[PDB]
Amino acid sequence: GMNIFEMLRIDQGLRLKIYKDTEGYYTIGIGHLLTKSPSLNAAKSELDKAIGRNTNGVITKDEAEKLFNQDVDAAVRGILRNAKLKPVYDSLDAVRRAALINMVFQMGETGVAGFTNSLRMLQQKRWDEAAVNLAKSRWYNQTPNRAKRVITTFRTGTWDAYGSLDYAAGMASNYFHGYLKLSLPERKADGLLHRMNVYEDKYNVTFGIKRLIILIPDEMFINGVIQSRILEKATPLETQFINRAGVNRPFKHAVYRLAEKVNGKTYYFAMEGATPMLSFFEAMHSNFSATWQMKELKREIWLKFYTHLNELIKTWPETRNLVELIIYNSHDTKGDLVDVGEMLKSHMELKT
């Protein structure tokens, strides 16, 4: 069932409606650039030329797959034209070739050609050595979860890194694809930034941070909810998602008011706990005292959820600047509970 389209769908993401890439450029599908023109009509005309119909900026999955496979064909020709990449590419099997193409999509041909030793190890079928060598790279440090899947593909020659996610990774994936990615990105008269502006103007208020703050504490909240000495709960912010079937569903994001002024101003914050992580913490509760195994497991899933979720948010241009992920110890050095209201107040004082 797996193939290079499904691979990049997982690693880079699939969009069936025009979106803006990291440079603001109109894009569709799996990263297929349409135009550098600022005109959405110009982008729609380039799309229509490429798909062969009036799409109005929306395409199907089969259309996106066809476009993507055209982009793979072009990447492969570039690889075969590149004296540093053709020999290793020729030597690899079809699955390992997909891994190399995956790197070329992420970092470009000249970036992949910088991995001279790793590529030689691959060409010599030294899979484990190449994998260790690749793990030491800045690529791995900046996108470790994608790099690990690609490295596993080089190491094994199988698609197995693209099968079912482990529990923490799958929790992050569902939380992003099923929730954050649907609620927050810009779209006609909706998404986080627009609805925050509507909210500010309806109540005559100002958000101190124009992002959704997501709290990933150590442990479930003391009473299972955010609490602070200096935050009061406000009316929630809403976005709307009209799915393919035409059903309008809301997303509600909690809003808090900072009860202590900061240079004369009251500030509001859209902020929530990372629900699937807190549900996991709740489920891990035992009526018996926790074992060291359970404490270790809680910490591992906490950290793995964060790294997967952080990477997804930051590598989708549409969400990168819309979320403030905060992972933190529930308690400071002196064993005192952290008050997120005071955290927010300090941050606003440093900002203003």
Numbering used by the authors: -14 to 337
Please share text taken word for word from the publication where this structure appeared:
Cyclic GMP–AMP synthase (cGAS) is a cytosolic DNA sensor that produces the second messenger cG[2′–5′]pA[3′–5′]p (2′3′-cGAMP) and controls activation of innate immunity in mammalian cells. Here we show that cGAS-like receptors (cGLRs) are innate immune sensors that are capable of recognizing divergent molecular patterns and catalysing synthesis of distinct nucleotide second messenger signals. In support of this conclusion, Hartmann, Imler, Cai and colleagues have identified cGLR2 as a second functional cGLR in Drosophila and have demonstrated in vivo that cGLR1 and cGLR2 have discrete roles in Drosophila immunity. Together, our results define cGLRs as receptors in animal cells that are capable of detecting diverse pathogen-associated molecular patterns and dictating response to the foreign environment.
We therefore developed an in vitro thermo-fluor binding assay to analyse dSTING recognition of specific CDNs. dSTING preferentially formed a thermostable complex with 3′2′-cGAMP and exhibited no detectable complex formation with 2′3′-cGAMP or other CDNs in vitro.
